[PDB]
Amino acid sequence: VLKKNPLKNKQVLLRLNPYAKVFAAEKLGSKKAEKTGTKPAAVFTETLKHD
Amino acid sequence: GIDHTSKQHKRSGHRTAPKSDNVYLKLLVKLYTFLARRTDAPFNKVVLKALFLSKINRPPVSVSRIARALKQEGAANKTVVVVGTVTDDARIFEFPKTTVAALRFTAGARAKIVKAGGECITLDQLAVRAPKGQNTLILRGPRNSREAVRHFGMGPHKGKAPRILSTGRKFERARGRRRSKGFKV
Amino acid sequence: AISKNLPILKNHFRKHWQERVKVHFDQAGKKVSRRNARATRAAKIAPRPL
Amino acid sequence: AKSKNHTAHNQTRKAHRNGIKKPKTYKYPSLKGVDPKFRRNHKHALHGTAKALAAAKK
Amino acid sequence: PSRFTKTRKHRGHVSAGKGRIGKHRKHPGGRGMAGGQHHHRINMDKYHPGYFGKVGMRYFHKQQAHFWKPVLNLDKLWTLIPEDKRDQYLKSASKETAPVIDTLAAGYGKILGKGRIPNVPVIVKARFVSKLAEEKIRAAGGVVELIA
Amino acid sequence: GKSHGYRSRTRYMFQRDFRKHGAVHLSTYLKVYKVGDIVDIKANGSIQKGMPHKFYQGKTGVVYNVTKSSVGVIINKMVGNRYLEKRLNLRVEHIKHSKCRQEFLERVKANAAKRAEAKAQGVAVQLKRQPAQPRESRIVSTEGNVPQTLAPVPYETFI
Amino acid sequence: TAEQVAAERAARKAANKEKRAIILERNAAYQKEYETAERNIIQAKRDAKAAGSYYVEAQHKLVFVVRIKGINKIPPKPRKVLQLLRLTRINSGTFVKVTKATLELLKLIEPYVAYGYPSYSTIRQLVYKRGFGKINKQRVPLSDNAIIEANLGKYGILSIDDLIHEIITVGPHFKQANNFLWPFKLSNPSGGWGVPRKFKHFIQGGSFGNREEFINKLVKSMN
RNA sequence: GCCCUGAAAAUGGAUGGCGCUCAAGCGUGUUACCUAUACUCUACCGUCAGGGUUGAUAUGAUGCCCUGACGAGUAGGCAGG
RNA sequence: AAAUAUGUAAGAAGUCCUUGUUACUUAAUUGAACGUGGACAUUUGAAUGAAGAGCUUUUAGUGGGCCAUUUUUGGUAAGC
RNA sequence: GGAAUACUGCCAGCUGGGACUGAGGACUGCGACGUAAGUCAAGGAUGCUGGCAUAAUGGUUAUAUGCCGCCCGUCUUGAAACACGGACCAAGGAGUCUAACGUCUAUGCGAGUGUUUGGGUGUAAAACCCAUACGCGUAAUGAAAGUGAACGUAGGUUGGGGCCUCGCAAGAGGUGCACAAUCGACCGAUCCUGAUGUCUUCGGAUGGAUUUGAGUAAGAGCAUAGCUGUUGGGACCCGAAAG
Numbered sequence A: 001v002l003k004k005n006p007l008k009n010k011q012v013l014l015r016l017n018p019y020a021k022v023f024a025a026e027k028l029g030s031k032k033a034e035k036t037g038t039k040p041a042a043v044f045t046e047t048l049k050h051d
Numbered sequence B: 001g002i003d004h005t006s007k008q009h010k011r012s013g014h015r016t017a018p019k020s021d022n023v024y025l026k027l028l029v030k031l032y033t034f035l036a037r038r039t040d041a042p043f044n045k046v047v048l049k050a051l052f053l054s055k056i057n058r059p060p061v062s063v064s065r066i067a068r069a070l071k072q073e074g075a076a077n078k079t080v081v082v083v084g085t086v087t088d089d090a091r092i093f094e095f096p097k098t099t100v101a102a103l104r105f106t107a108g109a110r111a112k113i114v115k116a117g118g119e120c121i122t123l124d125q126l127a128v129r130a131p132k133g134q135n136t137l138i139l140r141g142p143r144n145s146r147e148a149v150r151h152f153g154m155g156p157h158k159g160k161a162p163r164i165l166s167t168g169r170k171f172e173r174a175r176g177r178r179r180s181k182g183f184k185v
Numbered sequence C: 001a002i003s004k005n006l007p008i009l010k011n012h013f014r015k016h017w018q019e020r021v022k023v024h025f026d027q028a029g030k031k032v033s034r035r036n037a038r039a040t041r042a043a044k045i046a047p048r049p050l
Numbered sequence D: 001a002k003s004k005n006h007t008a009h010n011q012t013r014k015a016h017r018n019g020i021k022k023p024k025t026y027k028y029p030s031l032k033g034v035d036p037k038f039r040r041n042h043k044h045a046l047h048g049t050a051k052a053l054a055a056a057k058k
Numbered sequence E: 001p002s003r004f005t006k007t008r009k010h011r012g013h014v015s016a017g018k019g020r021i022g023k024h025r026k027h028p029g030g031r032g033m034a035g036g037q038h039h040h041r042i043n044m045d046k047y048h049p050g051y052f053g054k055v056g057m058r059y060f061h062k063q064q065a066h067f068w069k070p071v072l073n074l075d076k077l078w079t080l081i082p083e084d085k086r087d088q089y090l091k092s093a094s095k096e097t098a099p100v101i102d103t104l105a106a107g108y109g110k111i112l113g114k115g116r117i118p119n120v121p122v123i124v125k126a127r128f129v130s131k132l133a134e135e136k137i138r139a140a141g142g143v144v145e146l147i148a
Numbered sequence F: 001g002k003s004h005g006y007r008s009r010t011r012y013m014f015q016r017d018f019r020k021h022g023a024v025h026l027s028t029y030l031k032v033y034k035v036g037d038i039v040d041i042k043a044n045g046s047i048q049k050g051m052p053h054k055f056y057q058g059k060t061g062v063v064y065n066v067t068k069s070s071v072g073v074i075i076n077k078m079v080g081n082r083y084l085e086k087r088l089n090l091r092v093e094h095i096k097h098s099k100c101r102q103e104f105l106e107r108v109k110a111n112a113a114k115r116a117e118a119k120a121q122g123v124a125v126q127l128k129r130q131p132a133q134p135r136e137s138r139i140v141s142t143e144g145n146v147p148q149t150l151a152p153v154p155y156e157t158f159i
Numbered sequence G: 001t002a003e004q005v006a007a008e009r010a011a012r013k014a015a016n017k018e019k020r021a022i023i024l025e026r027n028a029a030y031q032k033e034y035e036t037a038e039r040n041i042i043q044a045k046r047d048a049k050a051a052g053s054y055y056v057e058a059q060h061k062l063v064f065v066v067r068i069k070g071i072n073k074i075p076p077k078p079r080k081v082l083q084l085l086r087l088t089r090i091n092s093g094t095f096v097k098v099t100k101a102t103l104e105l106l107k108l109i110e111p112y113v114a115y116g117y118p119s120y121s122t123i124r125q126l127v128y129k130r131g132f133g134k135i136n137k138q139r140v141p142l143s144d145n146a147i148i149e150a151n152l153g154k155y156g157i158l159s160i161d162d163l164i165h166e167i168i169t170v171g172p173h174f175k176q177a178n179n180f181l182w183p184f185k186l187s188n189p190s191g192g193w194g195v196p197r198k199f200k201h202f203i204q205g206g207s208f209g210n211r212e213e214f215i216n217k218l219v220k221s222m223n
Numbered sequence H: 001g002c003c004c005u006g007a008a009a010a011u012g013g014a015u016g017g018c019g020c021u022c023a024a025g026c027g028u029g030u031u032a033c034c035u036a037u038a039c040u041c042u043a044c045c046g047u048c049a050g051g052g053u054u055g056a057u058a059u060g061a062u063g064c065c066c067u068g069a070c071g072a073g074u075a076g077g078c079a080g081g
Numbered sequence I: 001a002a003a004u005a006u007g008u009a010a011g012a013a014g015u016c017c018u019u020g021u022u023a024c025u026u027a028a029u030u031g032a033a034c035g036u037g038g039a040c041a042u043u044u045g046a047a048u049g050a051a052g053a054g055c056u057u058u059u060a061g062u063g064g065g066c067c068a069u070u071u072u073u074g075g076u077a078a079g080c
Numbered sequence J: 001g002g003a004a005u006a007c008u009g010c011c012a013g014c015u016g017g018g019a020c021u022g023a024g025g026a027c028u029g030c031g032a033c034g035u036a037a038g039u040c041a042a043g044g045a046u047g048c049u050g051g052c053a054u055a056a057u058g059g060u061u062a063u064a065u066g067c068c069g070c071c072c073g074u075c076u077u078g079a080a081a082c083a084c085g086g087a088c089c090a091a092g093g094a095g096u097c098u099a100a101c102g103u104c105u106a107u108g109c110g111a112g113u114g115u116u117u118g119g120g121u122g123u124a125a126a127a128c129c130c131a132u133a134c135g136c137g138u139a140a141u142g143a144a145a146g147u148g149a150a151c152g153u154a155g156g157u158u159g160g161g162g163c164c165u166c167g168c169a170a171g172a173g174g175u176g177c178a179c180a181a182u183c184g185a186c187c188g189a190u191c192c193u194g195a196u197g198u199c200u201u202c203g204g205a206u207g208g209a210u211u212u213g214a215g216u217a218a219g220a221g222c223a224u225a226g227c228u229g230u231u232g233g234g235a236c237c238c239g240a241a242a243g
Helices: A008-016 A019-025 A042-048 B023-038 B042-052 B064-070 B106-116 B122-127 C026-045 D010-017 D036-055 E004-012 E085-091 E131-138 F099-119 G004-051 G076-084 G100-112 G120-130 G145-151 G158-169 G174-180 G217-220
Strands: B079-087 B099-105 B120-122 B137-138 E070-074 E100-103 E110-111 E123-126 E145-146 F038-041 F060-066 F070-079 F082-091 F095-097 F139-140 G053-055 G062-067 G092-097 G112-117 G132-135 G140-141 G210-214
Touching: A019 G004, A042 B064, B023 B042, B023 B122, B064 B079, B064 B106, B064 G217, B079 B106, B079 B122, B079 E145, B079 F139, B079 G004, B099 B106, B099 B122, B120 G217, B122 F070, B122 G140, C026 G145, E110 E131, E131 E145, F038 F070, F038 F099, F060 F082, F099 G004, F139 G145, G004 G145, G062 G100, G062 G120, G062 G217, G076 G100, G092 G174, G100 G112, G112 G217, G120 G158, G120 G217, G132 G145, G132 G174, G145 G158, G158 G174, G210 G217
Parallel strands: B079 B099, B079 B137, B099 B120, E070 E110, E100 E123, E123 E145, G112 G210
Antiparallel strands: F038 F060, F038 F095, F060 F070, F070 F082, F139 G053, G062 G092, G062 G112, G132 G140
16 A cells, blocks of 8 residues: 555665675675685786876 | 657557447346356357457348358358357258358258258356357358449449449440440449 | 549539429328228228228 | 749658558468469369368268 | 537537638538539549439339239248138148239239248239249249239 | 560660670579579570560569479569569579578578577577677787878879 | 564564575675776776777667657557556656667657666665655655665565665666656756756757766766 | 958848857867756546446435546547536 | 768567479579478567557548748749 | 675664654455464554533634735737726626538438428317329449440458357467458450441440549438538628729
8 A cells, every 4th residue: 555665764674685684694794705815917017007 | 758659549459349329238248247257268259259240240140051061061060159140041941950150040040950850059057068169160251242342442443332222234335344435434 | 513533423403403303291190091091991891892 | 923843741641540450361362363374273272172172071 | 408518518618629720611512512523523423323423214204013013932922811711721731722813913923943942832913923922832832823 | 656575775785795605504403493482683685485574574583383394483663652573484504493492491590509509508509690889908919010101192194 | 472472573573683694795795896897897997908909998788768748649659668667657767677669768868858877876866866666556665775686586686785786786687677767757957957958868958868878977967 | 271362233130149369169088057838646527448336224326436548630420517 | 071860770570400392593403492301589689669559331511721949932122 | 814894785784763654444365373272463543531511623704924926818939018908886798590511420211212392181380191293322434426234152362350160278270240451354445456237327345555534343312400610691790992
C-alpha cells in the first residue's frame, strides 16, 4: 500500500537481501587494500614528464 | 508529457455481455460466466463469448450441417453444440440419433432430431451433463452467406454485386459492363 | 447530388404530390358502414341471400 | 484569384497513422500471369499425385 | 422518437453537425443525379458500372407471366408429397404403387436437377424438365409424364 | 506544358557506363532463373525490349514466372499508405541474381554443417550472428615504441 | 483440516528459510567476485606500468541512458529510437547493452540524451529505490524477492541482487532482465545540471551525449 | 580588439523603464540563488486495461472488490447525464 | 564522384535424404513444378521494441492554409 | 628517503535542524531482534496533554490590498481590432415529417415469412380472429431463342478455435465447424470438338480452352422496430435581380 525504500528503513533492507547484515558486521564497505611495492619503469615517468 | 505510441483510453472492440434484454439469455450468460471462471475448460470460454454475439454473427446452423459434421470419424456419438438456433432441412433423408444442444430449435428441426430417436437439449441442460464441455462438437453457421456481403468490396474488377433495386437488362448492364459500351468494369 | 455506394433510387415526388395524399383514417369507419350496409340490405331482401 | 498549386506537405504524416503495414502474403499465391502451358500441365500433374496418393489408401 | 435523436445532442453547439467552413447549403453539386457523366462520374463508374447507354432488344407490350414457369429442384421434390404419406412410399419403394406428383398443381413449371433424391420410384407430372432432372428420376425407377 | 513520358528523366539512368558500350556479353544469357529467385532489376539501355520502367531501377523482387526470354518478377510498391503488388515482365538482360541471397543460402549450409559437427560431439551450437563487440583489455608495450609526442602546428600561407 | 494447515505452512516456512540461505550465499559470492575483479584491474595497470608498458581497460559493455529533452518537435528518426529505447518521457532512463548495433542508436538519439558508464553504487541504488518490474503490462514495485523469482526465476535470478548482478555484468539474459525493469522515472537533478544551458554537448560545456564516468554524479542527484 | 569618423525625417520618447562608467557596458571563467500547467513522491476525480468474487450464505451482478497506466483539443464522431 | 536519402535479404511457408505425379520439358526419369515417406527444434539462424496482433462494415468534417531551419527557382528587392 | 594533504570515488558508517503528507481500517504477507516467553520502526499514525461556548472554526458575501485578466459572436492563414452584427428586457425563434433505400442492432418466426385490400368479431377508429391471393426469399445465365448446378464421405492442399486419445506434466497424435489463401468439379454465356441418329438438314452426344457471369458446391430469409446515413419533397431557418 506504500512503497518502503531499502536505502532507509533497515527492515526492508534486510527483507530484500540478507547479507547486508554480514556486510555491515564485517564492515567491508571500507576494508583496507593489501599493500604492494610495484614501482613504474623509467620509460613511463620519462614520457610522463616529457615536453 | 509522454510521447504516446498508442491510442489512449482505447477500448477493446469486444462485446462484454449480450446487447439483448432477454432475461433468460442474461441467466444463460450468468451461468456460463461462472463455468468459464471456475473451470479450466476452453469450451466454456467459447460458449460464454458466443452468447454475446449479435444475430448476424449467429447465423443458423442447419440440420443437414449437423448430420454431415456427425459423419466425421470419431464423431458419431458426440453431443453437438450450437450457440444459436438450428433449422430444419428437407434435403437430407437419413438423419442419425445424437443430442443437439442449442439456443432455439425450429419446429421442423426439433422434430427431425427427435423422430430419429435423438434428443433436444438447452444450454444449461448441456451444462450439467458436461460442465467441462466433454465430448462436444461446437458448430457454427456460414457468415459470408449473408446477402449483405455480396455488395462488400464493390469496385472496378472486384467482381462483386451492385446495390441495385430492380435487376434486369436496362439495369446497370450497358456502359462499363461490356467491351462494346465504353469499357468493361 | 450523387455519393457513396448506395442503390440509385427512383422516388417520383417532383410533382406537387402533397395535394393528392390519401390517408385511410376511415378504414375503421368504412368497415362498420360496409357491415351496416350489408345487414340492412339482407333484412329487406326478405329471406334471399345477398 | 491565384492559389497554392501543389504540395506533399503533411502527406507522409497522414500516410503513417494506419499506414504501410506490409504486403499481405501467403503460401500458394495468385497464379495471375503464370505461363498458360504449365498451369495446364500442372493440373494433370496434381490430379495424378492425388490419384496415386489415395490409391495408397484404397 | 425525437428524444433519441442527434440534433438533441447538438443544441448549443453552433452550426449543428455541419461544419463552419463548408456550411450546410442548398444542393451543392445539384439535385438528384445531375452530371453522372461529368462532375459525378467517378462514383457512377465503380459503384454503378453499366448505368449509361443501351443493351439488347426492346419488347413492346411485354406480358409478364407469359413467362410464368417457377422452378423446383430434385433437391426438394419429395416436399410436395403430404408429409404423412411420405414415409409410406419411401419404405415401400414399389413400381406398381409409386406416388404421383402433380408439380403444376404445386404451383411450379419446371423441374431442375440440383441435388439427390433416394432410389424410390416416382411419377412426376410437369410441364418442362431439364435433361438431368429426368435422368435422375429415370435412374431411381420413376418417370416424367409431360402435362400442360 | 509539363512532360511525363515513359522514359522521362532517364537520360543518365538508362545510359551505359564509360567504355562498356556495345554488345552484351554471353554470361547474361547463360544464367538460369527459378521461381522464387531473388533478382535485382537494372535496365540495359541497348536492350529496348522487355525493359523495366524507371521506378523499378535499383529495385529487387521475387521471380514468379519463367518464359521464353523473360522472367516475371514481383515487386512490392508503395502507393498511398499501403504497399501494392506489382508483376513485371522483364527480359533477361535487365536482371541479375541477388548476391546477398547467394550469401544467405551459403550461410544456411554452413549453419547445417556446424550443427552436425556440434551434435556429432554432443556439444553446444551457437549459430546466430552477433554484432561487433566493445573490445577486451590489452597491454600495449613500449619496446621499440616510446611514444612520439605531438603538438598543434603554427599557421602558414603557401600561395 | 486443523492439522493440514500447519503442514502446508511449515512447508513454506521451511522453503522460504532455504531460499533465503541461497540468496545470502549468492550475495556473498558477488561481493567477492566484484572485490576481486576490480582489484585485478588495479594491479593489472600497476604491473603493466612496472613492465614499462600500458594496461588498457576493456571497453564498457554497459550504459545508462537518460532522456533530458521533452517530447515536442523531435525529428521522426530519433523519435523512433527514443521509443525503441523506452525513453518517451523526459528524465526517464534505461540500461543499454553496448554493441555496435546499439551504439549507432545512441549516435542518432544523442542530442536528447545524457549517458555514460554506471557504477555498481549507481545501479544498486537505482534498482533498490526505483526498481519496478513489468508484469502483465503493469508496473510493480520490487518490494519482495518473490516477485523477481516469480518472473525472472526461469533464468536463475531469484533476488534483487541477482537482478543487479545480471545488469552490471551484462551476460546471458541481460535482454530479458533489462526488459523486466520498467524505465526508471528519475526526478530533475537536485543541485541542478551544473551548466547554464543543457542542449549543447557535455564537451561543449553542457549536457547530452556521452559524459562517460560522469553519468553517476548526474543520476545520483536525479535518483 | 573596444572606441571615434563615415551615420540626414518629419507629435514628444524609449537597451521594456529607471538609471548604470575598475558598470548595472564588451570578451571569458567559477560558484550560489530565483521560477512553468514539465520532471519525482503522495491524496482525490475520471477514462482504459487486467484480475478476484453471489458456494448455503438479507440491502447494488449492468454489483462489491484488487491492481497498473493514462488525462491538450477546433471542424467532427460516439457515450453518459 | 561523396554525404544524406533509397531496394532486398537475415529461414518451419526452412534444410537435407529417399523416390511419387505430369499431357509441360529434355537426346535421356533428363529437367521443371507440386508431393508421399525419413531426419533436424537449448541460440531455430543479427539488434532494439511491441504499450496485444489480424480483419470487416460504415459514416462525419476537410478538400482557401500559413510559418521556421535547411535545399531551392522567378525577381533589384519585398512582411513578394 | 619517509610522510602528510588536496582532487576524485565507495561505505548495506554514525548522527543534528526544517518542511509537506498520515491514504488504509479485524486477522492473513515477507521479515527483524531475542536462549527464551516474548518483542518490533516488518502489507499506510499513534501516544500524552491542552484549548473552544452568545466561542474556536468553516461557508457565503461586500470592500480593500498584491499579482494577473482587451468584446463577445463570426468568416478567416491571421480579430481586441481602424472587419461585420449586437443600446436594453421579456416572450417567440432554425435538421422536421414523409415515400423509397445502405449499413449496424434488437426481436418474432424460419426454407420460408408478411393477421389489418378485404372478411369475421367487438366492452367499437381498440383488443381478439381469418380464407384465397399477392410480395420478398429458396436459381442462375444470356441481347435473345433458350438452357439450367454432386466424378469424389459435396473434392484436394495449407492455416484453423473447440472437442477426442496418450501422457503426471511438457508434449505428441486424431478430428477439425466459422473464416482465409490456392488447385479442382458443376450451371449459364462465348469460341471450339461434332459420336449414335434423321425425312439431307434436322439433331447436339462427348471432350475441350491465358475467355466471361451480380451462379453451384447440406439453404437464410421475411417482417416489425431504433440510431446514423442516401434521394425526392418548402426539406435546418431567414434572403435576390427576375419569370
